[PDB]
């Protein structure tokens, strides 16, 4: 049963949303009075309430999305809010649509998109995971932070071969180690006001840590936002090597740590923007001729559902997460980057 202190905070937050006439968040768009009244009395088995979903969007009215998952079951209990948010953010993933089963695909069809190292500075593929049986970061207790860091770090420290490396707890980290990790772009710090208000930064830094392999091509963050962020990266354009290393690491971790996955939504994450495959593939790439015609550049990327940002030089990444397989997402990135390089060469 939801307690009165929580209901009072919920009623005040709903009123705050309605009084902010300039608020444009998906939270405000889809938390109708009818849905609010239906959901405000519900609780997950782990104890999460509607407040553990919406509080960050109430506290940060300029949120784009404004809702987070406090545990895996929340996607079911609060589906009447999550479902239209997901459909809107993911551009047409309807409440009745279903994400395909996991398929990393045929690695032999993924390639080095720039063997000459003429255009691609670096290549990165990232994914995220929640561990089955644990609340998400809005609701982890201090004891759960300690237990899961022990379990995760033990599995990471047992990895061998290309994945052999070093675990660094944030707890007790000294300034020399911090600077070393900053120099490698491997450090994360306390979360921003969106994470803070989502209650994702409690008991800082208990249960938070960093792992990388000896070659510094494989990086794992523990409880930065999701339970696990798993990142593979290297200089140049060998997407085959980068993607296969990420998949190898994900599968090794999974052997002793089962992940939370939903038949409709795929892998379950703290932020609904990261569902489905959870995969973000990106390149840092130099395309100076296409830069002279940014409209043209933006048009090619859009054809392959890629987004182009700064970081002549661009960070180009895939936009799609839901309704396609891991293979399809990485292939979309490979195809798009190949087409961009082709058109740069012909320009």
Cα-trace Rg, the chain: 21
CB proximity list for 156: less than 8 A, separation 6 or greater: 165, 167, 211, 220, 253
Place of tokens 């994470």: 195
**Please, which experimental method was used?**
X-ray
Place of tokens 């720039």: 114
Element at 313 (helix H, strand E): strand 313-318
Q: Rounded to whole angstroms, how far apart are CA atoms 21 and 187?
A: 39
Task: Give the resolution value in Å.
Answer: 1.5
Q: Rounded to whole angstroms, how far apart are CA atoms 271 and 248?
A: 24
Residue 273: other Cβ atoms inside 10 A: 17
CB proximity list for 287: less than 8 A, separation 6 or greater: 119, 297, 312, 314, 340, 341, 344
Domains of the chain, residue spans: 1-95, 98-347
End-to-end CA distance of the chain: 65
Query: H-type helices in the chain, by residue range?
Result: 4-19, 26-30, 33-39, 51-59, 74-77, 79-89, 142-157, 175-183, 193-197, 239-254, 288-291, 294-303, 326-346
């Amino acid at each position: 049963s939801v307690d009165q202190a929580t209901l009072d905070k919920l009623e005040a937050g709903f009123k705050k949303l309605q009084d902010a006439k300039d608020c444009k968040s998906l939270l405000k768009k889809y938390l109708t009075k009818e849905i609010f009244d239906r959901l405000k009395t519900r609780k997950t088995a782990m104890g999460a309430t509607l407040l553990d979903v919406i509080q960050s969007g109430v506290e940060n009215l300029d949120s784009g999305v404004g809702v987070y998952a406090p545990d895996a079951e929340s996607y079911t209990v609060f589906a009447d809010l999550f479902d239209p948010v997901i459909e809107d953010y993911h551009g047409g993933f309807k409440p009745t649509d279903k994400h395909p089963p996991t398929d990393f695909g045929d690695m032999n069809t993924i390639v080095n998109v720039d063997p000459e190292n003429k255009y691609v500075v670096s290549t990165r593929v990232r994914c995220g995971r929640s561990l089955q049986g644990y609340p998400f970061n809005p609701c982890l207790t201090e004891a759960q932070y300690k237990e899961m860091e022990d379990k995760v770090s033990s599995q990471l420290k047992g990895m061998t071969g290309d994945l052999k490396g070093t675990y660094y707890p944030l707890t007790g980290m000294d300034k020399k180690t911090q600077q070393q990790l900053i120099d490698d772009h491997f450090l994360f710090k306390e979360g921003d006001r969106f994470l803070q208000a989502a209650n994702a930064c409690r008991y800082w830094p208990t249960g938070r840590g960093i792992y990388h392999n000896d070659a510094k091509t494989f990086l794992v963050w523990v409880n930065e936002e999701d339970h696990l962020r798993i990142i593979s990266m290297q200089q140049g354009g060998d997407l085959k090597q980068v993607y296969s290393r990420m998949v190898s690491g994900v599968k090794e971790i999974e052997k002793k740590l089962p992940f939370s996955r939903d038949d409709r939504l795929g892998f379950l994450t703290f932020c609904p923007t990261n569902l489905g495959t959870t995969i973000r593939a990106s390149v840092h790439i130099k395309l100076p001729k296409l830069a002279a015609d940014k409209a043209k550049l933006d048009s090619i990327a859009a054809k392959y559902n890629l987004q182009v940002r700064g970081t002549a030089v661009y960070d180009i990444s895939n936009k799609r997460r839901m309704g396609l397989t891991e293979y399809q997402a990485v292939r979309e990135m490979q195809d798009g980057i190949q087409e961009l390089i082709k058109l740069e060469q012909a320009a």
